[PDB]
Amino acid sequence: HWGYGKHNGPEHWHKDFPIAKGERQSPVDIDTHTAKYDPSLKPLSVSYDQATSLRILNNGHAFNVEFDDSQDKAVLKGGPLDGTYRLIQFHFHWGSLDGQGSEHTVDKKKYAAELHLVHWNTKYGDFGKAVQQPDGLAVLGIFLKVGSAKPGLQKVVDVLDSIKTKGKSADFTNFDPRGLLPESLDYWTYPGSLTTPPLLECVTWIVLKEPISVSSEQVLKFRKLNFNGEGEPEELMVDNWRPAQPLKNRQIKASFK
Ligand SMILES: NS(=O)(=O)c1ccc(CCNC(=S)Nc2ccc(-c3c4ccc(=O)cc-4oc4cc(O)ccc34)c(C(=O)O)c2)cc1
Ligand SMILES: [Zn+2]
Predict the structure, then answer these.
(1) In the CATH hierarchy, which fold is given to the domain comprising 1-257?
(2) Secondary structure string (H, E, C) spanning 206-254
(3) Is 1 annotated as a binding residue?
(4) Which residues does the annotation say bind substrate?
(5) What are the structural domain ranges in the chain?
(6) Catalytic positions, please?
């Protein structure tokens, strides 16, 4: 099916997922000079103290650290959000080289990778119902640059060898996502979509301005993963990012002056 290769990559997705050419697609380039500070934005609240991680899975597109979202444990509120959004999973998008990998870009700058913490609006009951709503999801995006190692990320890095191929999963309990956040919560926000098929336009994007630093060694291990399943020709899981899409009259708002 769809992927990131030359024959099934982003430029081909529209054939099976027409919304790919929609009016609210993600990611987008964030032109910092055009983004406007929005006084109406309420304080952003990231409450991950009771987060319950459960498993890590290689789904053939990236790897997901899944959480128990049967209760209001890890939640995201405030900012441009109305109500409570529950953390369900987080994953990354990265490149084959340090100069690329992020999905959103800042003044056209591409980061080495991008972390996506996915949350769904609790007023819709479940994730399935949420992806049928214009405000069903909220994804917190964090940029990764290559520099000093990120202590909180190492546990994720060290388990990757156990889920090298598509379909493989491993227990991943007691992981604290707070160790992946930068110091500042300054952010840019705009209405968008999922960046991979089905590309549904149900996401309120909140992209943090401050990137986190990860070591070359850490990202190199991300690049050892496989898109393929076990026993198949090895296709390194790299460059699993979608390029910037047309803004289409949308406005990106800044939480800071
Ligand atoms: N990069 S990004 O933008 O951050 C991003 C990209 C992709 C995705 C996820 C893409 N895949 C989707 S959407 N998967 C999906 C959607 C709905 C359901 C779903 C479906 C679907 C059809 C239906 O008829 C009833 C469903 O009921 C459901 C009840 C639930 O409690 C949770 C999910 C769920 C399920 C599933 O079955 O696990 C998976 C997340 C973030
Ligand atoms: Zn993503």
Answers:
(1) Carbonic Anhydrase II (3.10.200)
(2) EEECCCEEECHHHHHHHCCCECCCCCCCCCECCCCCCCCCCCCCCCCEE
(3) no
(4) 195-196
(5) 1-257
(6) 61
